[PDB]
Paper text:
Phosphoethanolamine (pEtN) cellulose is a naturally occurring modified cellulose produced by several Enterobacteriaceae. The minimal components of the E. coli cellulose synthase complex include the catalytically active BcsA enzyme, a hexameric semicircle of the periplasmic BcsB protein, and the outer membrane (OM)-integrated BcsC subunit containing periplasmic tetratricopeptide repeats (TPR). Additional subunits include BcsG, a membrane-anchored periplasmic pEtN transferase associated with BcsA, and BcsZ, a periplasmic cellulase of unknown biological function. Cellulose is a common bacterial biofilm component produced by a variety of prokaryotes, such as Escherichia coli (Ec), Salmonella enterica, and Gluconacetobacter/Komagataeibacter xylinus (Gx). These Gram-negative bacteria synthesize cellulose and secrete it across the cell envelope via the Bacterial cellulose synthase (Bcs) complex.
To gain experimental insights into the architecture of full-length BcsC and its interaction with cellulose by cryo-EM, we reconstituted the protein into a lipid nanodisc in the absence and the presence of cellotetraose. The obtained cryo-EM maps underscore the high flexibility of BcsC’s periplasmic domain. At lower contour levels and for the sample devoid of cellotetraose, the cryo-EM map confirms the solenoid architecture of TPR#9–19, while the N-terminal eight TPRs are insufficiently resolved or absent in the experimental map, Fig. 4a. Although the density cannot be identified unequivocally as a cello-oligosaccharide at the current resolution, its shape and interaction with BcsC are consistent with it representing a cellotetraose molecule, perhaps bound in different binding poses. Supporting this interpretation, no additional density at this site or elsewhere is observed in the absence of cellotetraose in a map of similar quality, Figs. 4b and S10. The cryo-EM structure of BcsC reveals that its periplasmic domain is flexibly attached to the β-barrel.
Residue numbers in the entry: 602 to 615, 618 to 1157
Write the structure that this text describes.
């Protein structure tokens, strides 16, 4: 029977061979069956046979009289087959007809996919109007939302609604947020303990970001002002010090007792659901400035979602690594530092919304700087998390993470020729993160903690690898000094807290605390940020809150 033969083929797709055979079987009894040929085309293009599908679709009878559901499928197929004009005219004919009819599932789907197509067609405003009409059609609201506030508040999530209403809400909210214009200003105070003069780091960073829509994506302009202070050297006597910094180990230094520097950087970039790219500069005003940037591509493969990126970034772990330092004017006066890491990375993830989720990442970078020994690194990271609580407004998870690092050379020292950044020969870390995210009508927050165990080893390294920089007289001394290697393992912990409050439709404020004690020498951060939305966002806030990230940390 035609009905059951059609049903058997259709049930699979909500899958190729059986459905195609069933559709062909219906084609024997009734060669003019429009639904059978539509299903055959759908299954063919689901297999990626676009070239055959576009030829098959032309065999359908004319649209002299057909239901809205069939015309919606035809329009979607034509749009995805690459014939945008026929789909555009079909939707232009369909949408007023959908509006004229009372609220129904057919008309709701027609308006939803029409809004989606119009958003892809290059008319986001008409897409927003069509979404406004679709919410009326889908039963979300009895009356059309006349202003941005009532339009946005209807997009808040609902636990009792069906799939159609939830999809309409999610799509309307996503499009509205994509079309919004945002201005964010954030202040970061960060640093870590160390030795005064080269490692007693305290830094301030003021970040200004403008986010605007462009095509289906968003473009961003970013400006960063960063000030780094590392204290002053402790003089032993006669106004001289002999710390393990620069060439002071060969001759007691003088002159540059205090060390600090500030600079401004710019960045411009763009990002969409698939592609992302960004280019900018190292903060101008430091000793050494280099151009940095990155590009990234993301796509789904099977059940997994993968991302491949290539980037060049600075290292902000210390002043010598980020902006570089100058040797004391009494000994050499030469400039050195400014380590840049350029390389590639590939990441995979799996999360279908259920209780379990996994992710992994691998990266390979080359580290090169001004008068700094060349280096390279390979890094592996992975994580798994089980969601104890997985409500749409409240998530509580506990998981296990693993990290493995290897570096070619250990250049953690601050002597001339070394970059002063952490670089172990073999590092392993296992952590157990516990996380809780929640949001309310006007409050959103995230709390996180993690205990970890880490092992690290570093090899013996010469103190002055760049022998040509050392003066001829000190040569015999410089070859006789080396930094002793060693291995160490132990426990550590990290904690984080994010909070965000909506005080006005166009005004959001938030604070973030990041404490690092996992024996990784990472600096601790404390930031306050304010965000202004031109159109206003009265719907559900971000979960978690999403503060800005310093451009040097990308």
């Amino acid at each position: 029977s035609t009905r059951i033969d059609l049903t058997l083929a259709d049930w699979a797709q909500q899958d190729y061979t059986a459905a195609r055979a069933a559709y062909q079987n219906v084609l024997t009894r009734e060669p003019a069956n429009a639904d059978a040929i539509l299903g055959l085309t759908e299954v063919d293009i689901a297999a990626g046979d676009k070239a055959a599908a576009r030829s098959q679709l032309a065999k359908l009878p004319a649209t002299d009289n057909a239901s809205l559901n069939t015309q919606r499928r035809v329009a979607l197929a034509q749009a995805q087959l690459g014939d945008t004009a026929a789909a555009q005219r079909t939707f232009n004919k369909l949408i007023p007809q959908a509006k004229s009819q009372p609220p129904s599932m057919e008309s709701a789907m027609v308006l939803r996919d029409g809004a989606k197509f119009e958003a892809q067609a290059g008319d986001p405003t008409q897409a927003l109007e069509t979404y406004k009409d679709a919410m009326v059609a889908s039963g979300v609201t009895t009356t059309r939302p006349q202003d941005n506030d009532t339009f946005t508040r209807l997009t808040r999530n609902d636990e009792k609604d069906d799939w159609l209403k939830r999809g309409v809400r999610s799509d309307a909210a996503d499009l509205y947020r994509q079309q919004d214009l945002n201005v964010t200003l954030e202040h970061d105070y960060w640093g870590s303990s160390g030795t005064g003069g080269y490692s007693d780091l305290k830094a301030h960073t003021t970040m200004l970001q403008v986010d605007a829509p462009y095509s289906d994506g968003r473009m961003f302009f970013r400006s960063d002002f960063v000030n780094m202070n590392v204290g002053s050297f402790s003089t032993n006597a006669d106004g001289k010090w002999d710390d393990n910094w620069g060439t002071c180990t060969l001759q007691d230094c003088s002159g540059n007792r205090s060390q600090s520097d500030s600079g401004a950087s710019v960045a411009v970039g763009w990002r969409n659901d698939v592609w992302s790219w960004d280019i900018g500069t190292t903060p101008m005003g430091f000793n050494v400035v280099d151009v940095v940037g990155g590009i990234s591509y993301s796509d789904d493969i099977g059940p997994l979602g993968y991302t491949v990126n290539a980037h060049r970034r600075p290292i902000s772990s210390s002043l010598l690594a980020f902006g570089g330092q100058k040797d004391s004017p009494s000994n050499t006066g030469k400039k050195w530092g400014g380590v840049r890491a350029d390389g590639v990375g590939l990441s995979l993830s799996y999360d279908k919304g259920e209780a379990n989720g996994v992710w992994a990442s691998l990266s390979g970078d080359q580290l090169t700087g001004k008068n700094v020994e060349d280096n390279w690194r390979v890094r592996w990271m992975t994580g798994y998390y089980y969601k104890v609580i997985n409500q749409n407004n409240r998530r509580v998870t506990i998981g296990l993470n693993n990290m493995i690092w290897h570096y070619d050379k250990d250049l953690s020292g601050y002597s001339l020729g070394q970059g002063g950044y952490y670089s172990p020969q073999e590092y392993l870390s296992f952590a157990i993160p516990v996380m809780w995210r929640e949001r309310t009508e006007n409050w959103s927050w995230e709390l996180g903690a993690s205990g970890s165990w880490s092992h690290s080893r570093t090899k013996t390294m010469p103190r002055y690898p760049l022998m040509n920089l050392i003066p001829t007289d000190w040569q015999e001394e410089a070859a006789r000094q080396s930094n002793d290697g060693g291995s160490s393992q132990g426990f550590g912990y990290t904690a984080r807290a994010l909070l965000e409050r909506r005080v006005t439709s166009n005004w959001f404020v938030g604070t973030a605390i990041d404490i690092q004690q996992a024996k990784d020498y990472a600096p601790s951060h404390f930031l306050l940020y304010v965000r202004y939305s031109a159109a206003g966002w009265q719907g559900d806030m971000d979960l978690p809150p999403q503060p800005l990230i310093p451009y040097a940390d990308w």
